[PDB]
């Protein structure tokens, strides 16, 4: 498949229920996504990581994944539109970056993906 | 007349016989191109820029084009910009960046301008420049 969204759309970080607003951005090769409270800990000899996206100012959903400017890198299943791809993403302890998620050119072929940088939520809710 | 390009593309500046290095870039909205020996002037009373690619390090090929106006420091300029077989008047801002990075860059406003859809897939895909 080759599926068309715009400069920004909406994901949603599959199993956590957030809807993040992602900027596709082509220039960036990895993918980027805000976080706050990042605390590396080992599980069973693992390297794990813990975090809240920076929009869970109440610390309401914790994630807790294993590890896949020198940021963790983590794999979180992200659906856009009615697309559920596995993204490997960056955990920035930066804020000022204005979108939660910035999807970059390898996670943009990972959703098999053609960018218009004249549309903006072409793919409206996330419902995969 | 949605045409389908892909993350780099050889784009060429019309009247200019240089083959210049985009990277289509969705994440920034103005365009830039990397120049060298920047030097600004006043013709008939309207700012002016003269300079050359940064590929052209034996200045073959004088660029002389109005000022549109400076951006927030570097001036910026219209240019018709060749890609595939479209022609378009892009904006783009004279950067003095290394001669690694890519020449041009090609933003969000550009790639709108010029119809495009950006296949993170494909490379190079509208061949050489043809307008």
Redesign the interface.
Same mark, same amino acid.
Not at 1 to 22: C, Q, R
Not at 93 to 120: C, H, M, N, T, W
């Given at each position: 498949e @080759?599926t +068309?969204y715009g /400069?920004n759309e909406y994901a949603a970080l599959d199993g956590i229920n957030l809807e993040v607003a992602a900027? /596709? *951005?082509?220039? &960036?090769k990895t993918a980027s996504l805000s976080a706050r409270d990042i605390k590396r800990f080992k599980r069973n000899g693992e390297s794990w990581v813990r975090f809240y996206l920076a929009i869970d100012a109440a610390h309401s959903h914790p994630i807790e994944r294993p590890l896949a400017t020198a940021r963790p890198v983590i794999e979180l299943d992200i659906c856009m539109g009615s697309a559920m791809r596995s993204i490997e993403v960056n955990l920035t302890d930066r804020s000022a970056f204005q979108y939660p998620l /910035?999807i970059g =050119?390898?996670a943009? @072929?990972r959703f *098999? &993906? /053609? +960018? *218009?940088? =004249?549309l903006k939520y072409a793919a409206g809710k996330p419902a995969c």
């Amino acid at each position: 498949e @080759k599926t +068309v969204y715009g /400069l920004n759309e909406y994901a949603a970080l599959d199993g956590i229920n957030l809807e993040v607003a992602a900027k /596709l *951005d082509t220039g &960036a090769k990895t993918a980027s996504l805000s976080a706050r409270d990042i605390k590396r800990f080992k599980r069973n000899g693992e390297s794990w990581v813990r975090f809240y996206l920076a929009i869970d100012a109440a610390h309401s959903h914790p994630i807790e994944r294993p590890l896949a400017t020198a940021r963790p890198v983590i794999e979180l299943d992200i659906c856009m539109g009615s697309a559920m791809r596995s993204i490997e993403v960056n955990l920035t302890d930066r804020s000022a970056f204005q979108y939660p998620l /910035l999807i970059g =050119s390898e996670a943009l @072929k990972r959703f *098999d &993906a /053609l +960018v *218009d940088p =004249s549309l903006k939520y072409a793919a409206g809710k996330p419902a995969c």
